[PDB]
Amino acid sequence: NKILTLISQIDVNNEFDKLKKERGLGNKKHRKEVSDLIKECQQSLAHSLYSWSCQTPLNREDTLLLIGYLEKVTVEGDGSLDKVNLTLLMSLLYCLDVGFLEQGTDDREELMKQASMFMDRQYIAAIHNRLQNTQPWKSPGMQATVRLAWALALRGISQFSEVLEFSEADEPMAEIAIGGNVFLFLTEAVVGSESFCTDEFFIRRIHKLVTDFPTLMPMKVKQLRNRAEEDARLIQMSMQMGNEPPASLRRDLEHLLLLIGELYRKDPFHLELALEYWCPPPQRQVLLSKFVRQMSDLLPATLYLPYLKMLRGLASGPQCAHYCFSLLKANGGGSP
Amino acid sequence: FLEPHLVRMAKLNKVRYMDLLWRYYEKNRNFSNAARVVAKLADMKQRLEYISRAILSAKSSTTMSTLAADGEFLHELEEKLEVARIQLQIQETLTRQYSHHSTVGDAVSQLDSQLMDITKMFGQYADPFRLSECKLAIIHCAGHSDPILVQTLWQDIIDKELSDSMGNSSVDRMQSLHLKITSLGKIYASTPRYFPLEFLVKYLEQQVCNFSWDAGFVTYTMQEINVPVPKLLEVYDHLFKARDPWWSRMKKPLHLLESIYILLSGYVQEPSKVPSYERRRFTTLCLDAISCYLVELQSMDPAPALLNTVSNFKSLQAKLERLS
Amino acid sequence: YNRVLRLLEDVGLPELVIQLATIAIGEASDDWRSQAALRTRIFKHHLDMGHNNQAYDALTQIPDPSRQLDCLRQLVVVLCERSQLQDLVEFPYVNLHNEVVGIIESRARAVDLMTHNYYE
Asked: What superkingdom does the record give (chain A) (predicted)?
């Protein structure tokens, strides 16, 4: 509580109301030097909770206190999260991330006792009950976005033990987030910030969230994939006859094909992270290589532009180029 | 003048005065002086309250402060709290034992009245009462490592519990012993120096053969204190291959064999006990062990129970092969 | 005689164990069970000392087939560890060539590739 209160209320309010009005910072050089120091100070304390997060899972009182902050977070008007508030959010994501519950390391019983998200059935329910509410954040896309990442966690835990009571509430939770075009909020607001290009662990956590989606709930995904492919064709073909398309259309599969296209588009780390999309089998690899082939079925003109952008993202890294060069070669040996 | 009034009065309700002093200090950004004053107070039933108050006030003094001296003083207060707690539980015990021992009460008053040194405590509270658990805790904290001493202490604890449990029904004795052992082990689980596995297991199995208890008791207890199944199996196999004539003398070598069998069967029924990445090799090891056991069973003169055990082992082997 | 045999086993005098076991086989003239037990003990001690040929002879003399087979498995395993594969090759198989093949096959399909030499 103190950590968050001091950091935010001190840095924003003072500089904006005292250092920007009185211009106590003398030259055009001091005003930047002090602003950079404050902006490095905040970014440092956010890296601290970020560095701690990727090592140590959070206890009960802290996870509730980090959730008690992300209930107020805002986004700059210029459509790009300030490098600070963004990393603080991707920090709690790695804390809540049950991607450590999905790794086959046999400390899984020790880590379930150290991760406070578990051992408290009151924890999973309290987060789900709060994100299912209709009081949206200072950015309604926030209540929907966080509601999704938790739901990807409520679905994955189903494998562990027999916690399969909240697996039902992962179907309407993913539909609510998709209906909020969360594939659009993560393409414009998160990756749009040029500071996301810096932190590698901002990429690994999202790449984990994007890869855990089609294989943790390969049932909820295949349903949400098949539903939109059919909802797109029916209306597009009926609009071609005589009318105009409904304004209530939500092409989140297009926005998702953009999101996979914008995320892997830039290559500064030489990771060739697109190696996950190329299969030369673990149940995860089959559910991914299927997702590459199961998505190729759609032929509607509405998803042609994004699926071409998705392949633009997937074709990063030399190996990922040749393979994707061979995929296009055979698809016409007709696929569009 | 509030500060010097407080100091003067505290030097000349001293507890109250020094408490107020430390409070004012912390408010006026002087928690270090608060601490110093509080420690001076601590040093200077009523004494029991003084100790409780001392502990509370030093906890307030160093919330995060890692000041070597003060931090060590707080650790010593926690160890003084250790003293208090162990003293009181064991005093309840020996009081109720010696017709409400008056000497126990006297000793407790002495222990609360002043902080004692290791040597004195050890000697004194050993001859009249033998507080083995407490002695073990003391040595653990200091860092003194004497394997023989540790083993002797463990043995004595068990024996005292057994003397007190003779009155109770076999089942009750067993359960109480189990609980006590588990709790004490959880305290020294990380330290193998203060937990002599081989000796303990051997002595406990001997006690089981003497009191005619269940074969699987030891195995279950060890699985409960998170002792890895591979490790437990290793220990059992080692004990078996040592060819201790004690078992032959007690007319129960087959009992030890059956206990090993029960451990193995429990593993097979719930394979999750062993970590997933070690399962295959562990299965191969079990298959080898089974082979050798079968060979020895076949070098012995046949008996109906022996044949039944042989058949059981072969079935276990088949199941393990199917698993691997 | 069996009591003295158990004595000599803990006593760790293998040769005495063997001769006394032979004398005890003689006393158990009609008892196939006892004969099999003592012969099994003899085989075991010979295998432990490195007396491969004697071990094999004791193995081929055990009346009980199951005991004989388990002893065969043990012999195979031990010779592999000591790298005495030449003698293993020399020793004929009582319609259990395929049995040996299968034992090693199962060992392979159950052990890590980078550690054991069963496959080889």
From this structure: Eukaryota
Mutate to test the interface with C, among B243, B299, B310, B322 (most CBs of C within 10 A): B299
Q: Which chains touch C (3 or more CB pairs under 8 A)?
A: B
For chain B, the chains sharing at least 3 beta-carbon pairs closer than 8 angstroms are A, C
Cβ-Cβ pairs closer than 8 A, B with C, add up to 51
C4 CB-side CA count, 13 A = 11
CB B51 within 8 A of CB B84: yes
Rg (CA), chain B: 27
Residue A227, Cβ neighbours under 10 Å: how many? 13
DSSP-derived secondary structure letter, A217:
S
Q: Which of residues 103-162 of A touch B (CB under 8 A)?
A: 104, 106
Note whether A282 contacts B: Cβ–Cβ < 8 A. Answer: no
* Burial of residue B171 (number of CB atoms within 10 Å: 0-12, 13-18, 19+): exposed
For residue A14 the two structure tokens come to: 């003072």
Nearest to residue A73, comparing CAs of A1, A125, A8, A16? A8
Contacts of residue A89, defined as CB under 8 A and 6 or more positions apart, other chains included, come to: A70, A73, A81
| Cα B97 to Cα B167: distance, rounded to the nearest angstrom | 13
CA separation for the pair B276, B256 (Å, rounded): 28
* Structural resolution in Å: 3.7
- Name residue B53's amino acid: R
Determine the Cα angle at A180 with ends A54 and A149, to 5°: 20
* Whole-number Å distance between alpha carbons of B62 and B31: 8
| Exposure on the CB side of residue A91, measured as CA atoms within 13 A | 27
Alpha-carbon span B293 to B280, nearest angstrom: 20
